[PDB]
Amino acid sequence: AHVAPGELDEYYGFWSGGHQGEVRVLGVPSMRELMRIPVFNVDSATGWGITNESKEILGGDQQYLNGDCHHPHISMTDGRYDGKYLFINDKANTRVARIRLDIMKTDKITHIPNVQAIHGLRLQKVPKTNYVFCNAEFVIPQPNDGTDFSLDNSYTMFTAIDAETMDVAWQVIVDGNLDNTDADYTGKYAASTCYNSERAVDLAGTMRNDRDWVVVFNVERIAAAVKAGNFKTIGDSKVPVVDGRGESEFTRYIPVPKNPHGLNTSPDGKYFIANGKLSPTVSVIAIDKLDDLFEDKIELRDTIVAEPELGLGPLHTTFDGRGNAYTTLFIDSQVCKWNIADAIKHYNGDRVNYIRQKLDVQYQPGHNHASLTESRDADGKWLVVLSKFSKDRFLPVGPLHPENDQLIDISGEEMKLVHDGPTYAEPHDCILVRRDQIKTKKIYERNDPYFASCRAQAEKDGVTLESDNKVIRDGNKVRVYMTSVAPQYGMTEFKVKEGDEVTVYITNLDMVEDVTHGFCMVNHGVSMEISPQQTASVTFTAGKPGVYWYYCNWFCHALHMEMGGRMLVEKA
Amino acid sequence: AHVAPGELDEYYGFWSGGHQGEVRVLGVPSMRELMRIPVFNVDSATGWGITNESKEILGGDQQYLNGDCHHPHISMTDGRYDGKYLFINDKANTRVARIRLDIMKTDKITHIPNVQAIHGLRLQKVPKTNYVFCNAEFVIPQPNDGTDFSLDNSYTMFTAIDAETMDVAWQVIVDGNLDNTDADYTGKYAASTCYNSERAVDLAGTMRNDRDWVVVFNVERIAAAVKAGNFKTIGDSKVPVVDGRGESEFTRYIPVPKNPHGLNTSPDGKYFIANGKLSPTVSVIAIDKLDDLFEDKIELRDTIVAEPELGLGPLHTTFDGRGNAYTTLFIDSQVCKWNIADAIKHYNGDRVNYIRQKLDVQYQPGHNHASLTESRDADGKWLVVLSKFSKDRFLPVGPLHPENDQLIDISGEEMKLVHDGPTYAEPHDCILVRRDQIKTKKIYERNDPYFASCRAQAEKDGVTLESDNKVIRDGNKVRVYMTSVAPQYGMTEFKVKEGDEVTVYITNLDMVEDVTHGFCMVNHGVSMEISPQQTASVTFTAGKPGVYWYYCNWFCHALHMEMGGRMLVEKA
Ligand code: CUA
Ligand code: CUA
Ligand SMILES: [Ca+2]
Ligand SMILES: [Ca+2]
Ligand SMILES: [Ca+2]
Ligand SMILES: [Ca+2]
Ligand SMILES: [Cl-]
Ligand SMILES: [Cl-]
Ligand code: NA
Ligand code: NA
Ligand code: NA
């Protein structure tokens, strides 16, 4: 449970940042934050959102200073984590990101078309992560062009992204809406919860139906229809769209009470578990019955093998790989341990006890996550419970309180609280991976894709980034290329005109690990990271005439304070 | 050392974020981050830098997405922390911020005129914090208007800000430059290091002189000259400027080797200690000799009562209140405990031993900070050492590594490492305060200054913020006022035209602690916090015609997912 100085954590944890927009890398079981990976936020330090390279990745037709990331998931090969990529949603500005786990940096951002608010996200497990599966939460008109605002004619879609290219593969129109999603251990099926079968905005409307549903997607049938050309398109997007509304070959709508929320696949591949939320239950769907259901051989509700009452406000379920499930009860403010097989007996009227233990948590739990739960190798060691209120649990810090991520030992029969982890607004889910499932680089190589655009521009200017310190004049544009070797930039002054569009490229020629440099231009609103063997750039408009200093903002050497230069801006 | 679940930390720590731009609130000795206070960064979650209230506080004539904050200090009454305000510098875009410690929010940002790169910052101690003292690091022409770029005619200034108004009080022109600063325990004196007596840009130039100096400011004389009207002004600023160059009544330039860096006041009020950096020394200046020096009764170097050799790269010194000092050695990667009285005897020629202990730290230490060191109540319990490299100390996370903030027990004769704390780029200094020295509010009062502007606009529109759900049209502006009680906004639909300038005001009517609401407009790049009894607002341009959902992004209730609404944008 404890990590001494000089000792390493046993697992990485990748935490969502919620509306703060980043991913946080923790060591488990120390629960210490090792790194922040900027995604949808703008990072003053590394310049994510400021650098040209990050801006290229972000794309889009407007700058967004925010995002809302909930659901981080790591790429799999044959149902085991492979450590290549992390993917996460953006509910705020309707995007999905991919993070490269070799350098812990975002490398792709995709805008999802003709939907709003990407919420649920999880990955194909088997045969490997070929698809990223994405829910859009909020129904909108199709197309959304202002000619018809009616809810009556508003819909959402389920989206599959090609994991390797990050281009959207296809979308499925559904009835109702989409909340959370998971995938099976064959590649054939994915499934999502719906809380708004009513397609309402008002609170009473969203709660009218006694049951909403889990919608199950026959990914095999969908992919085949898309391959055959049996699809349509919406609006300005060329993405293939198939229609899963009503009675469709692509979907099954299994009724589940009530405004259900989490959707979690058991690590033995047997079950999708929908969390009942307004219903004090979960609903256990037998994946091995879905083939029969897609042939209309059984009823929709025949796939339900258990629907146990657990307590008030079930939100999310996770697994120890020993046959138990752990479910957050938001209103009762507990985590409930229960046995799946015993709940199945109870549903059948063989009235065994199925609840093993309720542990109070502090306070109001959202997601929970057991170590390796999303893989075949679910190890039953650690359980993280991510609670949304902290009240009195930490020192007072004003009206805005931290969240509380609690680490619980589930290695034995009895859940035991070990650590209370204050966290800034606002983690949703997290994912734990063994140390040995991640392989990182300690320095860049000069062909790295993270500065492909810099190499391409340098070639146009005949600049050798590893060697040159040059000022290139291009009309109202100026490109400044500098090398850096601690504690010196290879250029200590340059001159431009007021209003010039200045781009500064810095290449870090240091080879020693951890010798990162920075670059900041005083009063010009720019900063960037340049780690060993990286190139990075920033663009800014030169301000009113005068001297402006630049300096290294990454303490790098005893002579760091002296690592700088001057930009001289002349009257045009 | 250890804080169990349900127990509280004994100290607050306020960490600088460096070029990440925020202040981080830690519990000590657990070393867990309790809260982030946005300052110069743009926070996707709370909307700091997006909300109208934060934008008014930031002011300026352009948006900055970045800052570089090093030096957090808390307001004092008679040399004891009083818990009212924290102040911090911005090196990147030449600002100073004040944080209100009742709500843990920035409330004032001041742009410092006619200087670049605010670095050193510390507070008046006695009789209380009336002044904030600020160093500007980089010499610039006066005025900085592009007519003369020469270093020969470039200078910097020391700045005093009125702590209560946050308006600049006066500035002092100096020779050389300014790095770090501290104040005495009378109010009369402040002092700064200089590393660039050469006023050079090139590295060899900045290290040419064997000695630079500590510049001591006679604050009493300066304030008198200003009150008498004996000052000038620079450029377009009305701030009073006095000239402390050369032989001046306002300054004394005590030679100190070599490119000295930290400047630290001992808690008995006896010494200013300059950290030698390129010289393996510190220089101990006796404050009780300064009156004699300002009457020319002693020589400049007669104020030096010790100049002990400690080791390679001394950067920052801190104090246990027992007569020992603790100095970071950046090159040797150690913290050195030494006895001040013995160093004075050694300087006098006595055959004595002033070094007590060298502890290896991991790796390359910058600032260090002992609990209550900046006050009379320096308690000698804890020492934080903030190191700039972490190498192998934490799990690998790519080319960019965390920093390492180490917690050391200094309560006894032997310094003992207790904890290694990974931190994101890049803390400089921190300040520790007892739990009982901070008094926070849990909910807002409706007269709070943090939404005075919202109140004034509501009044003009005839709106009662605590009761109204109204849409106000004013040309092409739309002001939308809503109340909120989780899980329902008081308005679930509103209509605007494409291109309208839409301002949404939300007033949180929940009264229970920790029931924070949020607000996000999908695809419009806005988010904001609304904590209990707060009002907050965001402004955005309505996009292309269509439906856009808004939702609460602060998990607030079991029905959080249903806390939404729609903005309907029509073609103009
Ligand atoms: Cu490069 Cu500090
Ligand atoms: Cu309001 Cu969640
Ligand atoms: Ca419903
Ligand atoms: Ca919360
Ligand atoms: Ca010098
Ligand atoms: Ca570092
Ligand atoms: Cl889920
Ligand atoms: Cl200092
Ligand atoms: Na099959
Ligand atoms: Na089958
Ligand atoms: Na099969």
Side-chain angles (χ1 to χ4, degrees), chain B residues 270-309:
Chain B
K270 292 189 183 167
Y271 307 114
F272 293 126
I273 300 191
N275 294 256
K277 195 172 83 187
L278 301 178
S279 173
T281 59
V282 304
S283 298
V284 180
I285 296 165
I287 292 169
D288 73 1
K289 299 189 187 299
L290 294 172
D291 280 358
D292 284 346
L293 183 64
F294 275 92
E295 297 310 310
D296 302 323
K297 288 172 184 175
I298 64 173
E299 304 295 341
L300 296 160
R301 287 286 297 182
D302 290 336
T303 65
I304 302 296
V305 296
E307 194 164 72
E309 183 174 322

Side-chain angles (χ1 to χ4, degrees), chain A residues 388-389 401-403 426, chain B residues 514 554-555:
Chain A
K388 298 303 193 170
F389 297 74
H401 297 53
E403 325 315 326
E426 181 192 291
Chain B
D514 208 355
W554 237 280
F555 212 112

Side-chain angles (χ1 to χ4, degrees), chain A residues 5-6 8-9 11-12 19-20 22 24 32-36 43-46 64 66-68 91-94 104 116 119 137-141 144-147 149 151 179 195 201 203 206 259 261 277-278 330 388-402 417-418 420 422 424-426 435 440-442 444 488 492 495 514 520 522-526 529 545-549 551 553-559 561-562 566 569, chain B residues 5-6 8-9 11-12 19-20 22 24 32-36 43-46 62 64 66-68 91-94 104 116 119 137-141 144-146 149 151 179 195 201 203 206 259 261 277-278 330 388-391 393-402 417 419-420 422 424-426 435 440-442 444 488 492 514 520 522-526 529 545-549 551 553-559 561-562 565-566 569 571:
Chain A
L8 301 177
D9 291 273
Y11 298 80
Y12 296 83
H19 49 303
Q20 186 281 332
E22 85 206 344
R24 302 167 185 165
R32 298 171 301 179
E33 184 188 82
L34 308 182
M35 188 46 51
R36 308 178 188 175
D43 178 31
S44 174
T46 64
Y64 297 114
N66 69 319
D68 183 19
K91 185 178 173 160
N93 303 305
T94 315
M104 299 296 178
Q116 277 179 199
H119 187 239
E137 192 176 334
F138 299 144
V139 296
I140 59 174
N144 188 25
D145 64 3
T147 66
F149 297 129
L151 286 164
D179 189 352
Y195 66 80
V201 177
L203 182 70
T206 71
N259 289 34
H261 183 58
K277 191 172 84 193
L278 304 177
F330 179 88
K388 298 303 193 170
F389 297 74
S390 65
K391 304 187 196 182
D392 56 333
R393 296 295 284 192
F394 309 105
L395 289 173
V397 289
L400 178 62
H401 297 53
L417 175 65
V418 169
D420 276 14
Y424 188 62
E426 181 192 291
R435 179 182 168 190
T440 69
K441 293 174 166 55
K442 278 286 171 172
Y444 286 91
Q488 291 180 281
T492 62
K495 185 173 287 171
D514 209 358
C520 178
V522 170
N523 291 355
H524 283 74
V526 295
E529 170 200 2
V547 170
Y548 303 87
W549 291 75
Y551 70 97
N553 58 5
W554 243 278
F555 213 111
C556 59
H557 192 276
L559 287 162
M561 303 301 298
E562 295 86 355
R566 303 187 302 154
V569 180
Chain B
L8 302 176
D9 287 277
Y11 301 79
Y12 291 89
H19 50 300
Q20 188 281 330
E22 87 203 346
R24 304 161 187 168
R32 302 173 297 181
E33 180 189 89
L34 309 183
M35 187 45 53
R36 303 183 191 173
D43 180 26
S44 178
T46 67
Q62 66 185 108
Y64 296 114
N66 75 318
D68 184 17
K91 187 174 169 166
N93 302 306
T94 319
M104 297 301 171
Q116 279 179 200
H119 184 234
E137 193 173 338
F138 299 143
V139 296
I140 59 173
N144 190 26
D145 64 4
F149 296 131
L151 282 169
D179 184 357
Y195 67 82
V201 177
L203 179 62
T206 69
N259 288 32
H261 184 61
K277 195 172 83 187
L278 301 178
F330 178 90
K388 299 302 189 168
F389 297 139
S390 68
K391 301 193 184 187
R393 290 300 280 194
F394 305 107
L395 289 174
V397 289
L400 176 63
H401 295 54
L417 175 66
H419 186 256
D420 279 14
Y424 190 63
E426 178 191 292
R435 169 178 177 192
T440 65
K441 304 170 155 53
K442 279 293 188 207
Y444 285 90
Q488 301 183 274
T492 56
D514 208 355
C520 174
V522 170
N523 293 356
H524 283 74
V526 297
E529 168 199 4
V547 173
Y548 303 86
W549 290 75
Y551 72 96
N553 55 5
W554 237 280
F555 212 112
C556 55
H557 194 274
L559 283 163
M561 308 298 297
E562 298 82 354
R566 304 186 303 148
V569 181
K571 299 96 194 268

